Short mmCIF file of N, CA and C in Angstrom, two decimals:
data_model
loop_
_atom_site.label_atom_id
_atom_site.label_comp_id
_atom_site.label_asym_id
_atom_site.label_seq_id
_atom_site.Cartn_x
_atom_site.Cartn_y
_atom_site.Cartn_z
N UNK A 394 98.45 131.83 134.52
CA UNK A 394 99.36 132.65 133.74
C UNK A 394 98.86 132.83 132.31
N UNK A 395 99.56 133.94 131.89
CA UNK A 395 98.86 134.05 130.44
C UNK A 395 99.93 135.06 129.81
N UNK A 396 101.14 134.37 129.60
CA UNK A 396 102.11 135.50 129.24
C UNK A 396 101.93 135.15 127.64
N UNK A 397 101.30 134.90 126.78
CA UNK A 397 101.47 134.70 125.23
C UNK A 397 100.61 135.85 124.66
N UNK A 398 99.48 136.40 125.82
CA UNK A 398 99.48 138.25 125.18
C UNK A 398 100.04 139.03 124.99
N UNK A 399 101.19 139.19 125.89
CA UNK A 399 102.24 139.97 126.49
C UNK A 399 103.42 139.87 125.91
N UNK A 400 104.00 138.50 125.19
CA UNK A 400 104.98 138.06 124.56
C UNK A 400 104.68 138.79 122.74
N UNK A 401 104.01 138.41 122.27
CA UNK A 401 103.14 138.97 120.90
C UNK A 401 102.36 140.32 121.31
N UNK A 402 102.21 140.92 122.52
CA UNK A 402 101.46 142.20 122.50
C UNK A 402 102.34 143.33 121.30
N UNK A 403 103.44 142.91 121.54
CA UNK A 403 104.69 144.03 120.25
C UNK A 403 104.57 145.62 120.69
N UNK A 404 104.33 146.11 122.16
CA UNK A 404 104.01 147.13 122.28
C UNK A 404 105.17 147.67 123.52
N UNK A 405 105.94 146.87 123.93
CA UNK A 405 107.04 146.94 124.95
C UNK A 405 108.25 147.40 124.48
N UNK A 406 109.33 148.29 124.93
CA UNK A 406 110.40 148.64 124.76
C UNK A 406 111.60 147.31 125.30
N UNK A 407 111.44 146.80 126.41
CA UNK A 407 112.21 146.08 126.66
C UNK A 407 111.27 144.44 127.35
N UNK A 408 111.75 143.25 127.17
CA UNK A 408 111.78 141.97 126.90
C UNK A 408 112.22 140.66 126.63
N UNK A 409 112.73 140.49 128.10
CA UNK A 409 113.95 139.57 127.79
C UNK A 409 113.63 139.12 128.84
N UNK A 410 113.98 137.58 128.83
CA UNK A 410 114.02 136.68 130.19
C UNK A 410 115.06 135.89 130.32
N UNK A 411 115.65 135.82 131.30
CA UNK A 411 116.85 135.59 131.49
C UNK A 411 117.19 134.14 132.60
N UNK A 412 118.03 132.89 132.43
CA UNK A 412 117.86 131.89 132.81
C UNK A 412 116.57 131.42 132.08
N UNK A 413 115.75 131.34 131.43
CA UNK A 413 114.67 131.10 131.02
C UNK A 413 114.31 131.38 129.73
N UNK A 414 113.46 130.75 128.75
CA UNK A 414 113.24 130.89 126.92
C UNK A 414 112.34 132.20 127.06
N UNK A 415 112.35 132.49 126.45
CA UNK A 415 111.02 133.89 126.72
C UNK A 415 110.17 133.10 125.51
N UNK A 416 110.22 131.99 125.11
CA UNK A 416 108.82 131.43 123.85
C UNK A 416 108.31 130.60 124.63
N UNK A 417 108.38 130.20 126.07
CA UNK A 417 107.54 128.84 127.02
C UNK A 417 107.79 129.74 128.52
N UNK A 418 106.63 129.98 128.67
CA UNK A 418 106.29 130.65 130.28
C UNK A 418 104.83 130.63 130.46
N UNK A 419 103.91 129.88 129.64
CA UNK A 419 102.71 129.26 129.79
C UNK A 419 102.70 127.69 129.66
N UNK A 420 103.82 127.34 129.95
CA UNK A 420 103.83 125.63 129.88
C UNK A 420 104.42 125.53 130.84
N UNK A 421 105.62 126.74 131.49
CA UNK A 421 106.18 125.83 132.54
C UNK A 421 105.47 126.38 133.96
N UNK A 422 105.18 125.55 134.86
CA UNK A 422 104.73 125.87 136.13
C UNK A 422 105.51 126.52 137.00
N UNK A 423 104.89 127.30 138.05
CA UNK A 423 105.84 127.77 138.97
C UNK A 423 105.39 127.72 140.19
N UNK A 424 105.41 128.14 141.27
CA UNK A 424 105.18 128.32 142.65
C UNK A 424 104.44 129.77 142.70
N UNK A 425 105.42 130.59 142.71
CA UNK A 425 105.02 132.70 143.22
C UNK A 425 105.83 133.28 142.47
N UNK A 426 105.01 134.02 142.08
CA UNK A 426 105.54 134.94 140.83
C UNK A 426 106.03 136.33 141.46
N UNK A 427 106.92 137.15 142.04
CA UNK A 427 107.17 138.33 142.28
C UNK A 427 106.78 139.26 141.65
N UNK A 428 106.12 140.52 141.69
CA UNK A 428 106.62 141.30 140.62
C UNK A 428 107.18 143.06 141.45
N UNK A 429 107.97 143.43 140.43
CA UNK A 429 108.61 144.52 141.16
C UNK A 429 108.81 145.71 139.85
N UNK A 430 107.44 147.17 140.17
CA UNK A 430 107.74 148.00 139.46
C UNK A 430 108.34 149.15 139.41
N UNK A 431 109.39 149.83 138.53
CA UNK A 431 110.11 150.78 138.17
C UNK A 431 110.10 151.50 137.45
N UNK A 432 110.36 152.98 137.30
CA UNK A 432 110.18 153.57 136.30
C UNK A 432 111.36 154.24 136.78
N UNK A 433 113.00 154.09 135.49
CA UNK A 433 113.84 154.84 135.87
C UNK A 433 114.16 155.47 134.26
N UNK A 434 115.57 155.65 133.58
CA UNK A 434 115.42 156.75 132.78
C UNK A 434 116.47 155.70 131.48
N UNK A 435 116.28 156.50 130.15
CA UNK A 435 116.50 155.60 128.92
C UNK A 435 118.49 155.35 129.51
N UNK A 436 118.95 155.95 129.55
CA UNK A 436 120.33 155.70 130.38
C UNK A 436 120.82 154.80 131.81
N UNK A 437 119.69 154.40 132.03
CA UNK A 437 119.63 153.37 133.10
C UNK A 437 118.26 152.17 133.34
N UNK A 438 118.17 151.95 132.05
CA UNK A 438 117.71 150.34 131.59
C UNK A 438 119.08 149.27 131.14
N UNK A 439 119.81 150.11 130.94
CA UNK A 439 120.76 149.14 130.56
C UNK A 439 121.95 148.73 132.07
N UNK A 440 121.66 149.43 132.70
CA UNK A 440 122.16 149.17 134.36
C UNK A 440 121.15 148.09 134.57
N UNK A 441 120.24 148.04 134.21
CA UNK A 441 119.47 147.05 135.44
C UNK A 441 119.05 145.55 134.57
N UNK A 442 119.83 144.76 134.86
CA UNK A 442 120.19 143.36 134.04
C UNK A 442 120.42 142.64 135.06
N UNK B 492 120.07 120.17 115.04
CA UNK B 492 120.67 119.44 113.81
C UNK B 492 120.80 117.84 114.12
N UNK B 493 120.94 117.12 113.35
CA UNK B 493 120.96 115.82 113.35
C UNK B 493 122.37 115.08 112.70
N UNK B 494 122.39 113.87 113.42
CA UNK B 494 123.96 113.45 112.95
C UNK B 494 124.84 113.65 111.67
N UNK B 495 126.10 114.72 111.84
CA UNK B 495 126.27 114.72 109.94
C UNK B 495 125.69 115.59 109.49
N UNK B 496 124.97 116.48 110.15
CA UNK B 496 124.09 117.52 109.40
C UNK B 496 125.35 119.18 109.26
N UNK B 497 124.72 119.75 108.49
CA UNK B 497 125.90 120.62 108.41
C UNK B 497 125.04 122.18 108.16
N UNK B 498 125.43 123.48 108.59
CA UNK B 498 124.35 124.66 108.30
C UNK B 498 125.32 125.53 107.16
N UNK B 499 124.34 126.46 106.71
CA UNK B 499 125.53 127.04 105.56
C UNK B 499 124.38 128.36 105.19
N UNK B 500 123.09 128.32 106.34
CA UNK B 500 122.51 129.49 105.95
C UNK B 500 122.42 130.47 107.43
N UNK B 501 122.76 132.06 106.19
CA UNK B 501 122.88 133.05 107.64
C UNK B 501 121.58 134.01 107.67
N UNK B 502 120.71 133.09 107.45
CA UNK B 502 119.48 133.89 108.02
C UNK B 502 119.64 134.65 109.33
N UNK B 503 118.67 135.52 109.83
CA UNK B 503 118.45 136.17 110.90
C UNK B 503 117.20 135.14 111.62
N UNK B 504 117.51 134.47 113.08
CA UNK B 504 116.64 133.90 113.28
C UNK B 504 115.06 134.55 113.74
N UNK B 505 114.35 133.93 113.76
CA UNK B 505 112.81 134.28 114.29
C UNK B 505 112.18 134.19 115.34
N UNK B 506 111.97 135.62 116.14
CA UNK B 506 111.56 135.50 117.58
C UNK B 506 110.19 135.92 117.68
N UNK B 507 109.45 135.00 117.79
CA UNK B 507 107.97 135.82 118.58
C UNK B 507 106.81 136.25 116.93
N UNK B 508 106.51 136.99 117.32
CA UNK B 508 105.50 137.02 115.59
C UNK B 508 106.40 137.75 114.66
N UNK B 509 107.00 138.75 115.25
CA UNK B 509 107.74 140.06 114.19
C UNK B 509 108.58 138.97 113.24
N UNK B 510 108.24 139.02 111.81
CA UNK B 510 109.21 137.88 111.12
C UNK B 510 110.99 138.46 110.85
N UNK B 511 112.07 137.35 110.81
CA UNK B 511 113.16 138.14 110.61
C UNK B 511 113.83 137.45 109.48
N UNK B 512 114.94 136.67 109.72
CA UNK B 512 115.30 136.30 108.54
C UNK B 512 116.12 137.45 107.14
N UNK B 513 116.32 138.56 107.64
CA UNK B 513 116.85 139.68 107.06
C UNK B 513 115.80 140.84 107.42
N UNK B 514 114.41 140.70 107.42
CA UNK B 514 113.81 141.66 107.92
C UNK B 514 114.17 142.27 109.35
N UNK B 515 114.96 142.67 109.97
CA UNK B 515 115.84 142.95 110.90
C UNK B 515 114.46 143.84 111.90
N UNK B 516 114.50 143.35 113.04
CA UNK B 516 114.10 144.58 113.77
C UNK B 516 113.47 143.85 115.55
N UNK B 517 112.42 144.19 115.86
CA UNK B 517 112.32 143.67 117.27
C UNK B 517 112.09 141.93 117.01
N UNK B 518 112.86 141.29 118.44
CA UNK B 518 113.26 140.09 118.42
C UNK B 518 113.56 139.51 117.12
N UNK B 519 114.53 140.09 116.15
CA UNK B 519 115.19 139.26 115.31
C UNK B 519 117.06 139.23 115.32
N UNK B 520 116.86 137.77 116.04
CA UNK B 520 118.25 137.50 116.29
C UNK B 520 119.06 136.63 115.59
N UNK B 521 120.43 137.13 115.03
CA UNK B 521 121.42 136.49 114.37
C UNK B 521 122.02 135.18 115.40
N UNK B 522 121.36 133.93 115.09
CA UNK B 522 122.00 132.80 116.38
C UNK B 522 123.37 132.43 115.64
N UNK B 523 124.08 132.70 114.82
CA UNK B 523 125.75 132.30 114.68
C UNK B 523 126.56 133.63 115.23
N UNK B 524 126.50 133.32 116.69
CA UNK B 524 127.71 133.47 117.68
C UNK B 524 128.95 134.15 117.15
N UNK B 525 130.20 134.48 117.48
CA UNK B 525 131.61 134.47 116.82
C UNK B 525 132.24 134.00 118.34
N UNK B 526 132.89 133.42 118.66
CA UNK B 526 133.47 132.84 120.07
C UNK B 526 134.32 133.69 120.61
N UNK B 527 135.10 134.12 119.93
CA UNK B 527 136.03 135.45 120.28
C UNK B 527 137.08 134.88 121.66
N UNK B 528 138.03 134.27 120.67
CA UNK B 528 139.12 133.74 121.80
C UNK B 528 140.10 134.49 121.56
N UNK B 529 140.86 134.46 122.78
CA UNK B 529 142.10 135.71 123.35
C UNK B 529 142.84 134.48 124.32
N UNK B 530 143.79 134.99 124.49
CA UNK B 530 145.13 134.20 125.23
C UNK B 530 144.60 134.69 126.67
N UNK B 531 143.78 136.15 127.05
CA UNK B 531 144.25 136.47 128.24
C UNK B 531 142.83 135.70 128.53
N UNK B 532 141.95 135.59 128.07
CA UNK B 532 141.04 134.21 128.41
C UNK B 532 141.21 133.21 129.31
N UNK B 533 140.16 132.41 130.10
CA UNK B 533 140.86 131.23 130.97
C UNK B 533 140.59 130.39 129.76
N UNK B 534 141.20 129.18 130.68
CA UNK B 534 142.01 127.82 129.98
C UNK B 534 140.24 127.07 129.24
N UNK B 535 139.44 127.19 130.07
CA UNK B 535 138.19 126.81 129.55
C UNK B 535 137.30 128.05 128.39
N UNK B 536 138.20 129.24 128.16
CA UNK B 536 137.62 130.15 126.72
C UNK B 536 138.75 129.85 126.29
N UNK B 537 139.36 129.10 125.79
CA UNK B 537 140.70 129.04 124.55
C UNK B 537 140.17 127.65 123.61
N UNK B 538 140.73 127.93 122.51
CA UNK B 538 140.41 127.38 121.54
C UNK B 538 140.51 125.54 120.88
N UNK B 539 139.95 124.81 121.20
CA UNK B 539 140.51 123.47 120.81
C UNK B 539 140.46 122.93 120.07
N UNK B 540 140.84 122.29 119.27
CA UNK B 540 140.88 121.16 118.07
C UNK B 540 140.77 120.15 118.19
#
């Protein structure tokens, strides 16, 4: 993992982790990482929480 | 905070590199809360002394 580019990249509209610190996600271990991409519209980012 | 310790400053806290502290803008978050209690609240959001 190497999310401390990505955390400081400063180039993202939205960034938030939820159940979880968004300042430690290169210290804590995990198992499988999912990932799932979307592209929907500025009126429905705030639906998807 | 530590035993007896007491806060009395309303900085804006500091997330990630962007500095805040009044410089307001991405990840700079105000951490003093307001609790916002109401009667129609359950018995565990009402207020205690």
């Amino acid at each position: 993992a190497d999310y401390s580019v990505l955390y400081n990249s400063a180039s993202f509209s939205t960034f938030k982790c939820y159940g979880v610190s968004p300042t430690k996600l290169n210290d804590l271990c995990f198992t499988n990482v999912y990932a799932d991409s979307f592209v929907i519209r500025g009126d429905e980012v705030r639906q998807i929480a | 905070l530590k035993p007896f310790e007491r806060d009395i400053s309303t900085e804006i806290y500091q997330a990630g590199s962007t500095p805040c502290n009044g410089v307001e803008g991405f990840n700079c978050y105000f951490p003093l809360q307001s609790y916002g209690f109401q009667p129609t609240n359950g018995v565990g959001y009402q207020p205690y002394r």
